[PDB]
């Protein structure tokens, strides 16, 4: 799931 968690890390970036 780590490789996925990196991809979820993309759109949650600080607005």
């Amino acid at each position, epitope marked *: *799931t*780590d490789k*996925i*968690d*990196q991809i*979820i*890390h993309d759109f*949650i*970036d*600080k*607005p």
Partner: antibody
Amino acid sequence: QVQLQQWGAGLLKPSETLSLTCAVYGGSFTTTYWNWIRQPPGKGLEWIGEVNYSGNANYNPSLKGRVAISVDTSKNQFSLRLNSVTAADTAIYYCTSRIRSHIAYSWKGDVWGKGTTVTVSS
Amino acid sequence: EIVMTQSPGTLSLSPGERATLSCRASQSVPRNYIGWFQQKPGQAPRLLIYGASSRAAGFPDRFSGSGSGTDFTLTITRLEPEDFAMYYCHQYDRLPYTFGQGTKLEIKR
């Protein structure tokens, strides 16, 4: 199984840089964002700053000029540097990870190590 | 900046009763990113619920969050003595991050 190990200098004289550091076991810097908060004694929580593995840092709008946070994934650790501190900054500093709050993430919540009491006194 | 107003700010209840804590956002929260922290005196805070309705691991089902948009609420059912502490509501959706002024849950006598 993530665990955060924080070490830093508790006692400092006024107008001295505050350097604290927090270490990450069990998880990568790239997977989760990291942030630093402080709780003054018997008062509400305050969020000083947040950091990403890429070096991008977003700071509380009040303290922006004084605070700078730097993170190095090489050692899997991130450090908070603050300058021109004053007695008003006396507080207990906690290094935490912002809430994930998504179904897909592993260990979907947040965990942090025991805060370091920082006392600024002449 | 989203200012957080917790109410009433001091809650006096007794074992067996139902506790309702309120947290209100100055501005809309688009992504429903909210959390609730339990802090006992002299002890580090423990995150309790995250998001809107999601409960953190290690806590009984009697703690339940609800709400959306501008208004959020935390409910404690059949409170045991160990639940009394100070509770903060936090918002990670939109920069800058902010915490609520806190609600003190005390034991009625």
